[PDB]
Nucleic acid binder design. Structure first.
Length: 88
RNA sequence: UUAGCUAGUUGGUGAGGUAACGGCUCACCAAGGCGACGAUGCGUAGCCGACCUGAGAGGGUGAUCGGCCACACUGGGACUGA
RNA sequence: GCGUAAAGGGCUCGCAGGCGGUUUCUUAAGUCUGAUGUGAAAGCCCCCGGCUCAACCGGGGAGGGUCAUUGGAAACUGGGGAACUUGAGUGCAGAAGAGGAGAGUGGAAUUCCACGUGUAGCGGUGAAAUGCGUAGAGAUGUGGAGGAACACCAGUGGCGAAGGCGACUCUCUGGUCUGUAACUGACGCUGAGGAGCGAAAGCGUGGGGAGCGAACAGGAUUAGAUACCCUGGUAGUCCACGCCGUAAACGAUGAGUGCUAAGUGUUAGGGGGUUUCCGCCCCUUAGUGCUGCAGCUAACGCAUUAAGCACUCCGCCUGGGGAGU
RNA sequence: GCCGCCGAAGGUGGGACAGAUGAUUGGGGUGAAGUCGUAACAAGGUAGCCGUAUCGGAAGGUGCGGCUGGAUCACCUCCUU
RNA sequence: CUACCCAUGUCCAGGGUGAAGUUCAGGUAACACUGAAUGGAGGCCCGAACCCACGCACGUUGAAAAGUGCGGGGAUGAGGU
RNA sequence: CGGGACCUAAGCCGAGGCCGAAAGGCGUAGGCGAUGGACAACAGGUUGAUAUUCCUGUACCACCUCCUCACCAUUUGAGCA
RNA sequence: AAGGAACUCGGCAAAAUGACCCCGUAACUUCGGGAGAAGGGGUGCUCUGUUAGGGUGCAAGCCCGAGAGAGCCGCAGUGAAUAGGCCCAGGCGACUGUUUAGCAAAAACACAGGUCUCUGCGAAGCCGUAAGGCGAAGUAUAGGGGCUGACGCCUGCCCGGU
RNA sequence: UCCUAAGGUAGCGAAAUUCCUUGUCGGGUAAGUUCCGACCCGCACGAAAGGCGCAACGAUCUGGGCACUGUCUCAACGAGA
């Protein structure tokens, strides 16, 4: 992926500022959903090591941004984590 | 080419004990605690002021004098007494 | 210190750890400084005196601490709060590729088979022989089966972390660079362990076996031929599922960042000068090749893709054999 | 005086670790003078080397992939003129 | 009778060992993975009824033309009946 | 109550049928054949001898109507089915 | 008694060990074991004490009871009967099983696994003189035949003979 | 060097394979014609008439120890048939 309905749809459903395309909660949202769909799409044919290395790098980047948002705002980071679902 | 260790062990309460806190020792309760910042285990060794050497940083020894610890044929024990 | 002498981990992802853009208020945790305590004596050093001097003795000093207690400075590292944007990330629009995984399809060529046509050789070599051929071979014509690899484009081209990746089409997917520049506001760099991938040979099972082909068979060359050569030929190569985790895994150069003469190629882009075109030329990135200044060096050589110049971090090196035993 | 608690030495047991010594045997070192080859350094007589697999009295051979640390053409990039 | 088959019934006292599988807690990005509890499969283990027939002794014109007494193996299966 | 006036398993017999000197071998439709499936009764007494049988109280099973009632319908049909 | 395998081809045979609870348990491995490994300690009774705590019950009441402290007595505390003796090191065979009823249970045979081979189904082999039927209401991942016997490492050379 | 088609490779080896033989050496013993370990002279091992190792199991087979005993040194009482 991600589909445009989830790129603009997910950024529209999780926009932190009114015109903020970034806002690292938004980067954790788009990178998180794209990492999930890349997780099933990697699991569909479990031999492709190239796409797997992409899944490891992407999931690691989403983890580093998750720790960054956790260090940037405590309660908002807990609300973004418990709202998103992952990190548990 | 030692990653396990620990069960009075980790901690509580209670009692006893000694000059004195303390699992110091026991009863009862809990399941703790230490570890890559090296636990435990093997090895070696009294440590220090200092001495010798080096331009200095460092490297080596703990003789003789002194300060503390230990031991008194080997291994326990308690009495007298401050 | 590590391109060639010993020394870059095969390569990546990441936790702990180590290090970190600019402005501003506080702090003293480090950093630094003043006061007290204490660092016993003897000893080392400085300054005197006494044994005829000296060794020595004695007196007078000094110095020795991530040391405590305590007072200041806030420049720098850090703690905390506020900030900002090039770093890094998201967005928007472009570009590109043999990056990967799965399915399907297509030819050229070799083998084999069936039948026609035809005869006496085919084959191989340095020269021959083994082998095949009158059971009709080679060649040639037609058709069928099956496997493996895709010629031309194709190139010190492209992509990928590396090993590596090539016929064509589709699904699913990662990544790179360019361009303004909407947002975020340091969210980064490395990273021992740990995790993961890693040619070819192998290893287990089950498939597949057209070519190639260790071991093996025969003939040749030689004094000898357990080799070179030729004729054959098993495993393997192929596939799927698992283990193997080594290579001259090479650029014998770890990653990241900043700077420092130039020229000439070459893809992937962008801005532009006029240009409807086209095309030339400049500026610009990114990637990659050659030629070379400074600088490095033992010499070869490297040289904006450094082995230059500095910073962060990891790994490796301490004569050879013994012995990677 | 008797009895209870713990208590050293000792005994019993199964372990662990370390050192001596052991018929033989494996690799290595050094050396008498030795017997077999000529593998490697020239294109070293088949270019080596690296990893792996098998075979060989042995240096080694051969297969697979990789590298030039490859003598050298001859394509060839694209080098100074 | 016995060897085998086929059809249909029946028997196997009690207690242990603990897997696969699950659930929970931890764990990764999901897996993996790890531990607790749950779990009862198995020609598993012990051992009686039962079946067998390895020891020994006896008996040997025997209680008996194959047994008896002490012991013994199997004892949810390839089982006995 | 066990068994037959119920059914069937391996098997057996088997009209017709098929093969084969003969005798017979096999086998269809059929039928037999429990160790199976279906299935209504029980608690006491009792003798020198029989019992979920005799007997004393309850029951149960199927069939049929000299009888009694209840309810339908008269083939535009109760019911057997 | 005392000595203990000197008897004997041979510890044949007897003697011995044994029940629970607890501690503790090696080499080796296929990671499950081995292993009831080995080697040890406790148990009888009285009281505290209708113990602690459970099952059951409304209470009453029974049952089921660890754990301990005091104390008793004996040579002896699962006092009796029935309940494993172990531990090294070898050869063979993976194993549990099966066989010579009535001498030989074993190192024999079986066995999963491994292979070589045949067979396309009115079948290969079967029993039949044939009919019929097994194989089978099976279909080359299935049947029949042979060889060898888990597992691990392998399975070297000769097609002259037959 | 002669012959065959080829001359047995690995791994084992005085084994259930070995006659000379009790092959030689070492361990175990006081003394070990069996046993364990290796040397290889394999009379007459050897790779699916499998070779070689192999935890678990044997009513197998064979050495060696602990405990324990009438197995005996050497028997002697006592109870039943």
């Amino acid at each position: 992926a991600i589909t445009q309905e989830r790129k603009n749809q997910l950024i529209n459903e999780f926009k932190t500022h009114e015109s903020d395309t970034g806002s690292p909660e938004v980067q954790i949202a788009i990178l998180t959903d794209s990492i999930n769909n890349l997780n099933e799409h990697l699991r569909t044919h479990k031999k492709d090591h190239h796409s797997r290395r992409g899944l490891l790098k992407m999931v690691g980047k989403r983890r580093n941004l998750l720790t960054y948002l956790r260090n940037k705002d405590v309660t908002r980071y807990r609300e973004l984590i418990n709202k998103l679902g992952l990190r548990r």
